[PDB]
Amino acid sequence: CGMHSPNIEVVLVKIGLQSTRIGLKLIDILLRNSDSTIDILYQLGTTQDPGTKDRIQALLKWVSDSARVAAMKTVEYGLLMPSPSHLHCVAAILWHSYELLVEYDLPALLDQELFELLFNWSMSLPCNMVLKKAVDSLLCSMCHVHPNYFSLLMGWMGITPLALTESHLATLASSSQSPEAIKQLLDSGLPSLLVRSLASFCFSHISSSESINKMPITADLVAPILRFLTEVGNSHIMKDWLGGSEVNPLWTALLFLLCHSGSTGLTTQQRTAIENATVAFFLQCISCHPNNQKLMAQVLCELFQTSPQGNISGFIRRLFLQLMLEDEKVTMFLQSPCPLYVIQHPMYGAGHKFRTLHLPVSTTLSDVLDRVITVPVFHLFHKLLAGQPLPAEMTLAQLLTLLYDRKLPQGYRSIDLTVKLGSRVISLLETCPIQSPLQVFAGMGGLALIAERLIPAHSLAAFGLFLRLPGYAEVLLKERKHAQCLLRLVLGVLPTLPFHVLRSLFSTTPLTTDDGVLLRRMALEIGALHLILVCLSALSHHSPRVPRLEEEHVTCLLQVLASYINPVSSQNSNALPSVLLELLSQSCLIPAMSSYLRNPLYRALLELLRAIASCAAMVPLLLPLQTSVGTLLAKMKTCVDLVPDIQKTAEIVYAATT
């Protein structure tokens, strides 16, 4: 069938929707006696005809028979075990029948006994296979159709002591994803009692470790119920509720539990479980939510500010290497009448005509559309935009900023686009991108805080010292991918960038403002000039005056020095202290300059010369300790004789020397 399968499925759909009896018979022989069967069931269930009610009745009768067969324990083989993909397809069919305007009374088909049967089926088997996920997606769709069914489900597990296994909470978290279920769950006291219980357990454990409506939570359920928190954090009002002072004890308690209380006893497997659940929670919280981004930035700055005086624990280290060093991932939803070529939420549809991806923000629309004369061309539209398409090279950060400026609520985890076919004959791109958690954390200088607590190797060692300066990260974040690659090389073009960011920061911070002089005096205090001078001494094989990659390194270091002397070149006399003058009189600048002269890089050296001649307080170092530099430079300029620049720089040096 692999060459003509669309034809077969289409003719099967037409024969099925010809009459009711034939469709019911073929449903029976396709379910009792693959992706294609999922598409067949979808097109049978969601297409509207007078025979739709009997078809969904047959589907419900089949799933009830399978639940019965699983409940007491030839034609019954399909009832001994059902395909979980078929159950997810039935859930999608019921969901799209509830969503679309149907002629029949859909909740009349749903029965409470079906709720009891599928609930007993759910606890009859463990959580490893996907059959539990399928029957739980069916439970979620049916309870979305019937809110009173979920309302009675709360009354079963003692909710208006308690003991819930991991499968119980798994079924509840799976079946709470629908808006009516999550509305009833917020209306129910189960989330409030669980967060109060886990906060009390954390506080009790902290009090026991530091001394060396409430309900006791054991050491096993806490990782699954933290995963419950991760799964419910998709709602934006959930993210706002987690941002209040009522919840903040959860954060502080979990951190004090997982840092101070080392190996009540925490075993390594459960510690890893809580560790991974907290990673998932942190990844879930700040997803497309700038408020959560600044919240985590403030929280991590407060933890790094009160770091003990020196070793960083494994959790905080891996959280730094994980949370803000991977690109932000958003949920992509694609609706299209044309074919576009795992269990997901029923908002995301089914079949190949509904697409759902979990993709990083940094990519553009051309890459996600490639992976999924009048010429038909794909065009992208939004439900909040009327009459204009979307550019192919526009990244998702720009789209997220446009939607957040277009009344889309903050924290909306899944963005939806419709693909249409237009004709081609053979402002939007200029918007600001998303801020991202990494740059938000770097906005208040958290990089210096984490540096204080922490290919040639000397450049990578000097990068950590260089990023301690304020304003370094703001100019560092201009190229995201290469900065992330450099941080990945730090944890354990590439050597040029730690100095190129310093040169650009020197050039963007002039001497006419307070930021430039503060940066220069902090560089004088922390000792960056000594490090770059001994690096130049080691690279040039020359010693200070005691009282192919190397060429690029020397050129870049000379460029850094030139941008340090004159920021405008890339009260000026008293803008720089004489400490730099007495420091440069000791180093190896003069002998290396004399060695290199007597032999881009020449252009950088001439820029350094006009920079060192531009500052009057930096002038008297040019006198050698007896040929002047101006006459020498004129001699080798006549020897060389680009040319107008060389002549202008030589004339400037000659004027400075005279």
XYZ file of C-alpha atoms in Angstrom:
658
model
C 0.000 0.000 0.000
C 2.945 2.350 0.547
C 2.666 3.934 -2.891
C -1.142 4.285 -3.014
C -2.057 4.457 0.700
C -3.823 7.887 0.517
C -6.089 6.491 -2.202
C -6.932 3.442 -0.075
C -7.696 5.466 3.040
C -9.820 7.945 1.060
C -11.851 5.208 -0.634
C -12.259 3.519 2.764
C -13.562 6.796 4.215
C -16.055 7.175 1.359
C -17.244 3.555 1.690
C -17.550 4.031 5.456
C -19.550 7.247 5.155
C -21.715 5.717 2.419
C -23.974 3.973 4.955
C -24.156 3.212 8.666
C -24.125 -0.606 8.577
C -21.048 -0.863 6.346
C -19.191 1.685 8.466
C -20.023 -0.171 11.680
C -18.941 -3.486 10.127
C -15.645 -2.039 8.915
C -15.038 -0.399 12.298
C -15.496 -3.845 13.850
C -13.129 -5.538 11.370
C -10.515 -2.758 11.743
C -10.530 -2.690 15.550
C -10.936 -6.414 16.305
C -10.129 -8.437 13.172
C -0.679 1.633 12.647
C -0.909 5.308 11.692
C -3.235 4.535 8.768
C -5.827 2.978 11.086
C -5.561 6.079 13.289
C -6.301 8.267 10.267
C -9.231 6.016 9.306
C -10.719 6.258 12.799
C -10.152 10.029 12.837
C -11.847 10.616 9.481
C -14.713 8.330 10.526
C -15.254 9.956 13.919
C -14.803 13.633 13.099
C -16.642 13.825 9.760
C -20.248 14.898 10.324
C -23.053 12.723 8.969
C -26.294 11.145 10.242
C -24.237 7.987 10.893
C -21.717 9.682 13.195
C -23.660 8.896 16.375
C -23.752 5.168 15.631
C -20.027 5.211 14.805
C -19.058 6.866 18.089
C -21.485 4.497 19.834
C -19.586 1.571 18.305
C -16.260 3.104 19.363
C -17.506 3.591 22.931
C -18.904 0.049 22.979
C -15.519 -1.274 21.806
C -13.570 0.645 24.442
C -16.073 -0.430 27.116
C -15.614 -4.058 26.056
C -11.826 -3.703 26.230
C -12.110 -2.096 29.670
C -14.384 -4.948 30.791
C -11.964 -7.590 29.478
C -9.130 -5.898 31.336
C -11.404 -5.605 34.389
C -12.163 -9.269 35.042
C -8.471 -9.997 34.332
C -10.726 -15.103 17.852
C -12.987 -12.047 17.883
C -11.933 -11.138 21.439
C -8.238 -10.704 20.554
C -8.697 -6.983 19.893
C -10.348 -6.778 23.320
C -7.583 -8.673 25.148
C -5.333 -5.673 24.490
C -6.108 -2.501 22.522
C -3.558 -0.398 20.680
C -2.823 2.708 22.796
C -2.615 4.799 19.626
C -6.179 3.721 18.816
C -7.320 4.802 22.283
C -5.621 8.182 21.862
C -7.351 8.476 18.484
C -10.719 7.727 20.116
C -9.958 10.422 22.695
C -9.167 12.883 19.897
C -12.402 11.897 18.116
C -14.465 12.583 21.239
C -12.579 15.838 21.784
C -13.160 17.129 18.265
C -16.813 16.120 18.485
C -17.170 18.116 21.709
C -15.241 21.054 20.220
C -17.038 21.146 16.872
C -20.746 21.906 16.628
C -22.318 18.444 16.402
C -25.972 17.600 15.848
C -26.091 14.868 18.509
C -26.056 15.138 22.305
C -22.492 13.981 22.919
C -22.526 13.927 26.785
C -25.576 11.622 26.640
C -23.334 8.853 25.271
C -20.912 9.274 28.187
C -21.826 7.180 31.237
C -20.560 7.190 34.825
C -20.109 3.413 34.697
C -17.612 4.042 31.895
C -15.764 6.358 34.294
C -15.624 3.603 36.910
C -14.529 0.983 34.362
C -11.712 3.069 32.876
C -10.626 4.240 36.343
C -10.367 0.639 37.586
C -8.558 -0.215 34.345
C -6.105 2.620 35.018
C -5.156 1.357 38.464
C -5.108 -2.266 37.248
C -1.751 -1.748 35.497
C 1.533 0.080 36.264
C 2.972 3.227 34.694
C 5.683 1.806 32.415
C 3.605 1.098 29.304
C 1.791 3.662 27.151
C -1.560 1.898 27.632
C -1.943 3.812 30.901
C -1.263 7.062 29.035
C -3.849 6.143 26.391
C -6.617 5.237 28.840
C -5.749 8.373 30.809
C -6.033 10.549 27.695
C -9.435 8.938 27.148
C -10.302 9.764 30.764
C -9.159 13.353 30.211
C -11.299 13.811 27.105
C -14.380 12.218 28.671
C -14.055 14.301 31.858
C -13.617 17.373 29.661
C -16.975 16.487 28.111
C -18.463 15.822 31.584
C -17.281 18.089 34.432
C -19.595 16.320 36.887
C -17.669 13.106 36.185
C -14.420 14.706 37.342
C -16.343 16.284 40.241
C -17.362 12.796 41.345
C -13.811 11.551 40.722
C -12.560 13.921 43.437
C -15.072 12.435 45.895
C -13.610 8.947 45.405
C -10.111 9.613 46.766
C -11.415 11.355 49.882
C -11.492 14.886 48.439
C -14.473 17.211 48.837
C -6.637 10.246 55.932
C -5.349 9.855 52.375
C -3.085 7.489 50.460
C -2.372 7.934 46.749
C 0.136 5.861 44.813
C 2.200 7.072 41.875
C -0.380 5.726 39.413
C -3.176 7.658 41.160
C -1.377 10.990 40.820
C -0.225 10.030 37.316
C -3.840 9.503 36.255
C -4.899 12.757 37.925
C -2.096 14.789 36.308
C -2.834 13.225 32.929
C -6.597 13.726 33.244
C -6.277 17.281 34.598
C -4.793 18.794 31.427
C -8.173 19.763 29.983
C -9.493 23.243 30.861
C -12.601 21.973 32.661
C -10.541 19.424 34.601
C -7.939 22.005 35.611
C -10.720 24.456 36.522
C -12.288 21.830 38.788
C -8.848 20.950 40.152
C -8.203 24.569 41.087
C -11.722 24.716 42.529
C -10.958 21.506 44.431
C -8.718 21.723 47.468
C -6.342 18.979 46.311
C -3.597 21.331 44.961
C -3.799 23.538 48.054
C -3.660 20.604 50.470
C -0.806 18.962 48.560
C 1.316 22.114 48.492
C 0.616 22.732 52.193
C 1.523 19.114 52.973
C 4.781 19.193 51.006
C 5.755 22.562 52.481
C 5.120 21.166 55.972
C 7.184 18.056 55.174
C 10.049 20.189 53.854
C 9.913 22.482 56.899
C 9.893 19.486 59.254
C 12.881 17.946 57.472
C 14.747 21.274 57.607
C 14.017 21.609 61.328
C 15.214 18.050 61.949
C 18.399 18.577 59.912
C 19.224 21.924 61.552
C 18.688 20.560 65.081
C 21.579 18.079 64.831
C -5.451 20.787 57.031
C -2.104 18.978 57.054
C -1.072 15.523 55.900
C 2.236 13.606 56.069
C 4.002 13.086 52.718
C 6.518 10.245 52.489
C 9.875 10.166 50.668
C 8.468 8.339 47.623
C 5.536 10.517 46.515
C 7.421 13.842 46.644
C 9.211 13.456 43.291
C 6.017 12.419 41.421
C 4.043 15.261 42.991
C 6.781 17.720 42.061
C 6.274 16.349 38.548
C 2.581 17.133 39.122
C 3.641 20.737 39.782
C 5.705 20.696 36.574
C 2.733 19.424 34.563
C 0.287 21.961 36.032
C 2.702 24.898 35.588
C 1.512 25.374 31.981
C -1.267 27.715 33.135
C -0.282 31.375 33.323
C -2.268 31.963 36.510
C -0.415 28.950 37.903
C 2.819 30.781 37.083
C 1.467 33.915 38.782
C 0.435 31.882 41.842
C 3.891 30.292 42.007
C 5.329 33.822 41.926
C 3.629 34.929 45.138
C 4.939 34.993 48.686
C 2.673 32.072 49.612
C 4.647 29.716 47.360
C 8.244 31.048 47.888
C 8.571 28.847 51.015
C 8.365 25.899 48.581
C 11.442 27.181 46.716
C 13.420 28.033 49.854
C 12.442 24.767 51.554
C 13.397 22.587 48.578
C 16.727 24.390 48.251
C 17.526 24.063 51.972
C 16.503 20.403 51.801
C 18.709 19.601 48.799
C 21.770 21.632 49.901
C 22.260 21.479 53.684
C 20.833 18.000 54.336
C 23.543 15.843 52.798
C 24.158 12.121 53.120
C 15.523 11.356 58.003
C 17.808 10.287 55.165
C 17.920 11.166 51.462
C 19.039 8.261 49.284
C 20.865 8.914 46.025
C 18.105 7.622 43.730
C 15.448 9.792 45.381
C 17.894 12.712 45.431
C 18.366 12.339 41.670
C 14.578 12.090 41.274
C 14.020 15.392 43.105
C 16.982 16.881 41.232
C 15.523 16.016 37.815
C 12.024 17.080 38.882
C 13.363 20.467 40.012
C 15.175 20.818 36.677
C 11.898 20.115 34.869
C 10.081 22.601 37.122
C 12.635 25.336 36.440
C 12.506 24.639 32.698
C 8.694 24.756 32.809
C 8.370 27.942 34.873
C 10.331 30.415 32.738
C 9.095 29.068 29.400
C 7.938 32.151 27.426
C 7.234 33.959 30.738
C 9.396 37.090 31.218
C 7.986 37.588 34.727
C 9.218 34.133 35.721
C 12.494 34.978 33.948
C 13.124 38.030 36.121
C 11.853 36.079 39.143
C 14.427 33.312 38.663
C 17.097 35.928 37.931
C 16.360 37.677 41.236
C 16.197 34.339 43.076
C 19.523 33.102 41.697
C 21.174 36.467 42.381
C 19.929 36.219 45.966
C 21.291 32.677 46.336
C 24.648 33.594 44.770
C 24.876 36.728 46.928
C 24.489 34.650 50.114
C 26.901 31.953 48.973
C 29.031 30.672 51.877
C 32.651 31.774 52.086
C 33.356 28.972 48.467
C 32.557 25.612 46.899
C 29.387 25.442 44.806
C 27.154 22.407 45.254
C 26.294 20.114 42.370
C 22.705 21.334 42.038
C 23.580 25.015 41.567
C 26.479 24.191 39.233
C 24.412 21.944 36.978
C 21.549 24.460 37.075
C 23.935 27.110 35.792
C 25.232 24.734 33.121
C 21.684 23.680 32.161
C 18.862 26.189 32.602
C 20.208 29.407 31.025
C 22.799 27.712 28.763
C 20.263 25.903 26.600
C 18.101 27.867 24.192
C 14.471 28.536 25.069
C 12.047 25.938 23.715
C 8.462 26.742 22.714
C 5.557 24.602 21.521
C 4.713 24.922 17.823
C 1.163 24.115 16.669
C 0.389 23.786 12.944
C -3.103 23.690 11.432
C -3.442 23.120 7.698
C -5.916 21.484 5.286
C -2.962 20.193 3.228
C -1.033 17.144 4.501
C 2.025 18.014 6.603
C 4.937 15.584 6.303
C 3.849 10.063 20.691
C 0.840 11.110 22.801
C 0.049 14.811 23.129
C -2.729 17.112 24.353
C -6.071 17.028 22.473
C -5.720 20.762 21.701
C -3.021 19.631 19.283
C -5.345 17.480 17.172
C -4.468 14.150 15.603
C -3.382 12.723 12.276
C -0.878 14.319 9.934
C -3.044 17.380 9.195
C -2.429 18.646 12.759
C 1.232 19.110 13.661
C 2.871 19.714 17.035
C 6.582 20.237 17.619
C 8.674 21.198 20.653
C 11.291 23.406 19.097
C 13.880 25.987 20.180
C 13.015 29.655 19.780
C 16.259 30.574 17.986
C 15.253 28.858 14.730
C 13.212 30.590 12.022
C 10.117 29.610 10.055
C 12.022 28.393 6.983
C 13.684 25.577 8.936
C 10.511 24.343 10.650
C 8.590 24.587 7.366
C 11.291 22.700 5.458
C 11.244 19.862 8.011
C 7.439 19.657 7.758
C 4.979 31.216 -13.467
C 2.332 30.653 -10.793
C 3.821 28.500 -8.020
C 2.049 27.428 -4.797
C 3.851 28.767 -1.722
C 3.243 27.984 1.942
C 2.246 31.012 4.015
C 1.821 31.302 7.779
C -1.096 33.056 9.479
C -2.150 33.649 13.075
C -5.646 33.799 14.526
C -4.853 37.282 15.897
C -3.537 38.607 12.553
C -5.918 39.239 9.643
C -4.745 39.537 6.041
C -0.949 39.329 6.153
C 1.454 36.373 5.870
C 4.636 35.730 7.838
C 8.238 36.064 6.605
C 10.173 32.843 6.167
C 13.385 34.097 7.828
C 11.690 35.642 10.902
C 12.732 33.849 14.084
C 10.338 32.791 16.835
C 11.611 35.371 19.338
C 10.323 38.156 17.086
C 7.020 36.294 16.693
C 6.722 35.872 20.468
C 7.371 39.583 21.011
C 4.781 40.477 18.356
C 2.179 38.231 20.000
C 2.941 39.567 23.484
C 2.442 43.044 22.008
C -0.779 41.736 20.401
C -2.833 40.949 23.535
C -1.638 37.330 23.752
C -1.491 36.555 27.494
C 1.940 36.133 29.024
C 2.999 32.554 29.622
C 1.055 31.072 26.690
C 2.994 27.835 26.287
C 1.806 26.697 22.820
C 1.676 29.124 19.883
C -0.567 28.190 16.953
C -0.109 28.972 13.239
C -2.230 28.065 10.217
C -0.531 27.129 6.940
C -2.189 28.231 3.696
C -1.314 27.932 0.004
C -0.830 31.157 -1.943
C 0.337 31.976 -5.454
C 3.751 33.418 -6.314
C 4.918 34.714 -9.699
C 8.536 34.032 -10.648
C 8.604 46.348 10.175
C 7.976 42.718 11.112
C 11.635 41.677 10.802
C 12.935 44.789 12.616
C 11.243 44.072 15.956
C 13.173 43.266 19.121
C 13.641 39.580 20.032
C 12.808 37.943 23.353
C 14.988 38.824 26.334
C 15.597 35.134 27.328
C 16.452 33.979 30.882
C 20.221 34.177 30.309
C 20.301 37.843 29.289
C 17.721 38.654 31.981
C 20.049 37.067 34.550
C 22.985 38.976 33.062
C 21.114 42.305 33.175
C 21.841 42.820 36.878
C 25.374 41.394 36.658
C 24.864 37.856 37.940
C 27.856 36.714 35.878
C 30.197 38.572 38.232
C 28.460 36.917 41.196
C 28.955 33.441 39.728
C 32.532 34.290 38.693
C 33.419 35.326 42.247
C 32.157 31.933 43.474
C 34.084 29.953 40.832
C 42.667 26.468 21.668
C 44.963 28.251 24.127
C 43.980 27.898 27.773
C 45.114 31.366 28.884
C 42.384 33.063 26.833
C 39.742 30.814 28.406
C 41.177 31.569 31.854
C 41.170 35.316 31.148
C 37.567 35.192 29.896
C 36.370 34.323 33.401
C 38.211 37.337 34.792
C 36.926 39.560 31.974
C 33.267 38.641 32.497
C 33.428 39.907 36.098
C 33.243 43.517 34.912
C 29.790 45.156 34.823
C 28.472 45.700 31.317
C 30.572 42.872 29.865
C 27.657 40.456 29.456
C 25.411 43.085 27.836
C 27.853 43.428 24.924
C 28.701 39.704 25.140
C 25.112 38.603 24.420
C 25.157 40.106 20.879
C 26.154 36.718 19.410
C 24.234 34.064 21.328
C 25.506 30.866 19.694
C 29.237 31.601 19.903
C 28.907 32.883 23.475
C 27.126 29.653 24.410
C 29.873 27.654 22.681
C 32.526 29.588 24.615
C 30.709 28.940 27.901
C 30.512 25.253 26.954
C 34.274 25.285 26.386
C 34.765 27.066 29.725
C 32.787 24.472 31.701
C 34.679 21.584 30.092
C 37.411 32.746 16.366
C 36.938 31.039 19.728
C 40.041 32.545 21.448
C 39.472 35.891 19.694
C 35.970 36.449 21.094
C 36.890 36.932 24.820
C 39.120 39.806 23.672
C 36.790 40.976 20.884
C 34.005 41.505 23.413
C 36.458 43.484 25.554
C 37.454 45.660 22.574
C 33.803 46.297 21.669
C 33.028 47.147 25.303
C 35.989 49.547 25.355
C 34.757 51.201 22.153
C 31.139 51.433 23.339
C 32.212 52.980 26.677
C 33.836 56.379 26.033
C 35.968 58.404 28.427
C 33.397 61.233 28.502
C 31.056 59.262 30.799
C 31.396 57.696 34.236
C 30.958 54.097 33.048
C 34.159 54.145 30.994
C 36.367 55.560 33.743
C 34.777 53.244 36.328
C 35.440 50.262 34.046
C 39.032 51.400 33.486
C 39.715 51.851 37.206
C 38.132 48.475 37.987
C 40.330 46.876 35.317
C 43.303 48.599 36.959
C 42.242 47.238 40.353
C 41.482 43.646 39.329
C 44.699 43.294 37.315
C 43.570 42.631 33.749
C 46.335 44.765 32.223
C 49.038 42.714 33.957
C 47.499 39.525 32.551
C 47.230 40.855 28.999
C 50.775 42.262 29.193
C 52.294 38.973 30.353
C 50.247 37.225 27.650
C 51.740 39.561 25.036
C 55.186 38.968 26.561
C 54.764 35.195 26.266
C 53.392 35.455 22.717
C 56.059 37.880 21.444
C 58.971 36.114 23.232
C 60.035 39.399 24.847
C 60.588 40.434 28.464
C 59.569 43.662 30.238
C 62.174 46.324 30.959
C 63.346 45.338 34.448
C 64.597 48.472 36.314
C 49.862 31.743 12.558
C 47.564 31.805 15.586
C 50.143 33.772 17.587
C 50.068 36.568 14.997
C 46.276 36.786 15.304
C 46.603 36.767 19.101
C 49.149 39.607 18.985
C 46.964 41.595 16.572
C 43.867 41.142 18.737
C 45.783 42.081 21.900
C 47.108 45.220 20.195
C 43.541 46.037 19.142
C 42.390 45.598 22.753
C 45.149 47.938 23.951
C 44.270 50.494 21.259
C 40.607 50.424 22.284
C 41.679 50.745 25.929
C 43.755 53.870 25.253
C 41.331 55.720 22.963
C 37.715 54.467 23.014
C 36.617 56.878 20.271
C 39.325 55.625 17.880
C 37.717 52.179 17.579
C 39.359 66.822 30.152
C 40.959 63.906 28.311
C 44.315 64.551 30.009
C 43.021 63.750 33.514
C 40.548 61.107 32.302
C 43.192 58.425 32.942
C 45.340 58.214 36.098
C 49.129 58.075 36.096
C 49.029 54.558 37.582
C 48.508 53.263 34.040
C 51.408 55.469 32.909
C 53.780 54.022 35.519
C 52.511 50.494 34.808
C 53.129 50.780 31.061
C 56.629 52.160 31.705
C 57.601 48.830 33.323
C 56.038 46.339 30.887
C 57.296 45.062 27.518
C 55.477 47.537 25.256
C 58.568 49.478 24.143
C 60.882 46.499 23.372
C 58.157 44.525 21.584
C 57.207 47.671 19.648
C 60.852 48.197 18.645
C 61.243 44.530 17.675
C 58.059 44.424 15.595
C 58.675 47.757 13.857
C 62.218 47.049 12.627
C 61.062 43.882 10.819
C 45.509 44.573 9.284
C 48.197 44.052 11.929
C 50.102 47.088 10.649
C 46.788 48.963 10.485
C 46.024 47.941 14.076
C 49.492 49.084 15.150
C 48.977 52.454 13.446
C 45.603 52.731 15.195
C 47.400 52.008 18.469
C 49.930 54.717 17.574
C 47.283 57.359 16.888
C 45.479 56.276 20.072
C 48.642 56.606 22.177
C 49.231 60.000 20.534
C 45.637 61.130 21.139
C 45.894 61.138 24.957
C 48.303 63.818 26.157
C 49.026 62.119 29.496
C 49.988 58.985 27.566
C 52.424 60.898 25.314
C 55.765 60.888 27.248
C 56.157 57.085 27.060
C 57.034 57.401 23.350
C 60.512 58.745 24.165
C 63.005 55.851 23.939
C 65.258 55.090 26.889
C 68.588 57.686 20.375
C 66.153 57.607 17.443
C 62.630 58.945 17.882
C 59.637 56.821 16.927
C 58.412 59.439 14.444
C 61.593 59.514 12.362
C 61.794 55.707 12.422
C 58.160 55.365 11.332
C 58.794 57.891 8.551
C 61.815 55.873 7.395
C 59.923 52.589 7.203
C 56.923 54.386 5.675
C 59.174 55.593 2.858
C 60.566 52.048 2.688
C 57.049 50.604 2.363
C 55.931 53.259 -0.135
C 46.463 51.689 2.881
C 49.025 54.270 1.758
C 46.961 57.355 2.790
C 46.232 55.766 6.180
C 49.927 54.961 6.683
C 50.922 58.503 5.692
C 48.307 60.082 7.977
C 49.311 57.946 10.968
C 53.011 58.623 10.355
C 52.314 62.362 10.153
C 50.300 62.180 13.386
C 53.147 60.354 15.151
C 55.667 62.872 13.783
C 53.526 65.789 14.982
C 53.196 64.197 18.426
C 56.960 63.655 18.665
C 57.715 67.222 17.563
